[PDB]
Write a protein that binds this ligand. Structure first.
Ligand SMILES: C#CCCCCCCCCCCCC(=O)SCCNC(=O)CCNC(=O)[C@H](O)C(C)(C)COP(=O)(O)OP(=O)(O)OC[C@H]1O[C@@H](n2cnc3c(N)ncnc32)[C@H](O)[C@@H]1OP(=O)(O)O
Ligand SMILES: Cc1nn(C)c(C)c1CCOc1cc(F)ccc1-c1ccc2c(c1)c(CN(C)C)nn2C
Ligand SMILES: [Cl-]
Length: 385
């Protein structure tokens, strides 16, 4: 690969290798005064659009763009189908900027053909806490691919982030770009065995017959942590302490405020599920997972694979295996077909015993305008939606 765009940017070259004595920007002493005040030029016939995600119709336009044009797996079997309510949650976190929700319209039809977004948060990288933008939902319509629109969207959002005196960003992608700070494979725990076989997600063999696969993945409908219950507003302070204390061990994590804990964890049906174990007025264990369906392309029977994605999980009164067993059970009780997790935090340590299967790819973690040492994904303590 030539990386003709990415090598113009303050990111490491593909062979760059920094040791742990280095943890700092590529470019420092930046000045808001010097940031370009003009919008980046689009090709003739296209215009920038300020998306108001709190407006149902603008939000539905983003939803349609992503439903038809967003991420597919490597074999083009599935396409993510984030719900409109999910997009509202993901994009309106504390202190979010409407002007960081950037659309591109094709003038002649007035239809949205491109999108990119960022939200602000404090990111701790190798013990240094930096205000960053978290970039997500970059999407160009399938009919306009490989026309160099993506670098325009990236340059325009960079400009708008810089106008807020923010000079670093965090982002994830499946493609390999210069240059990952970490790389985490994803794994899958079957819940609805027959459906997964019928859609070609899982496989059988002469030893693993259908009935044997169903028995293998069967789960007992009893929690190891008996009092695990849906999180409520009263639990925000305790989750903030429990999760915040846990995350400090990692090389990369968000430093959540109490307002951010309330936003990212208080349950929303079909969006975000958080369960807590309260003992003596203290939150001692937590489970959380978000809902991200994938459209099953071409399937006449099933429109979607209903998947729960592991978010943040902490235990102090059980083993991590027992906690994640309860997470799988809670996903099953909420009608999910599969439970998906990355090999971040303590997750990989339970994948064999809890009967996860390895997926077919990995999610790379990246920083913009930051040079530092890379690390194994068990040292990652952040999950991007
Ligand atoms: C401070 C502040 C800084 C703020 C900015 C920080 C950097 C942020 C980078 C963006 C991060 C995005 C995180 C995501 O949200 S993840 C999900 C990605 N969503 C999809 O997977 C949906 C399906 N897919 C698509 O919609 C399109 O394929 C895309 C992804 C829009 C790409 O458009 P297409 O038409 O292919 O490509 P064109 O417009 O010719 O642009 C080619 C250049 O672009 C680079 N690129 C491609 N995919 C990228 C990607 N996902 N993230 C970043 N860069 C990407 C690529 O390498 C190349 O540049 P070079 O020539 O190699 O230097
Ligand atoms: C099922 C299924 N459906 N689809 C459509 C796929 C790709 C799968 C495979 C299963 O992927 C995963 C499983 C996990 F446990 C955790 C993460 C992913 C994942 C993979 C690639 C990803 C994304 C998320 C995102 C979205 N955020 C993070 C930017 N972008 N990219 C390019
Ligand atoms: Cl129970």
């Amino acid at each position: 690969p030539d990386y003709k765009f990415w090598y113009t940017q303050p990111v490491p070259k593909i062979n760059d290798e920094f040791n742990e004595s280095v943890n700092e920007p590529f470019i420092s002493d930046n000045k808001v005064e010097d940031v370009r005040k003009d919008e980046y030029k689009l090709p003739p016939g296209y215009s920038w659009y300020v998306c108001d995600v709190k407006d149902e119709k603008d939000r539905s336009e983003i939803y349609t763009l992503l439903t038809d044009n967003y991420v597919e797996d490597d074999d083009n079997i599935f396409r993510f189908n984030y719900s409109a309510e999910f997009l509202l949650w993901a994009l309106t976190s504390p202190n979010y900027l409407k002007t960081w929700h950037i659309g591109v319209k094709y003038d002649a039809s007035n239809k949205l053909i491109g999108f990119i977004s960022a939200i602000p948060t404090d990111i701790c990288i190798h013990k240094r806490t930096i205000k960053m933008a978290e970039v997500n939902f970059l999407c160009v319509h399938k009919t306009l691919r490989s026309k160099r629109l993506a670098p325009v969207l990236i340059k325009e959002i960079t400009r708008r982030i810089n106008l807020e005196n923010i000079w670093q960003a965090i982002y994830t992608a499946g493609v390999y770009l210069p240059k990952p700070v970490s790389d985490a494979r994803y794994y899958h725990r079957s819940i609805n065995v027959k459906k997964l076989i019928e859609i070609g997600f899982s496989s059988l063999n002469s030893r693993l017959t259908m009935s044997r696969a169903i028995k293998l993945y069967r789960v007992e409908d009893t929690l190891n942590i008996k009092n695990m219950r849906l999180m409520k507003k009263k639990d925000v302070e305790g989750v903030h302490k429990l999760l915040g204390s846990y995350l400090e061990q990692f090389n990369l994590y968000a430093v959540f405020t109490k307002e951010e804990i309330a936003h990212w964890f208080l349950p929303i049906e079909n969006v975000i599920y958080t369960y807590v174990n309260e003992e003596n007025g203290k939150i001692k264990d937590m489970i959380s997972f978000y809902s991200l369906p994938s459209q099953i392309l071409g399937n006449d029977k099933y429109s979607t694979l209903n998947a729960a994605y592991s978010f943040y999980n902490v235990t102090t009164t059980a083993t991590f295996k027992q906690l994640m067993q309860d997470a799988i059970l809670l996903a099953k009780r909420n009608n999910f077909d599969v439970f998906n997790a990355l090999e971040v935090m303590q997750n990989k340590s339970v994948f064999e015993d809890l009967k996860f299967g390895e997926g077919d790819g990995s999610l790379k973690y990246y920083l913009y305008n930051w040079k530092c040492a890379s690390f194994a994904p068990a040292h990652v303590g952040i999950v991007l939606l």
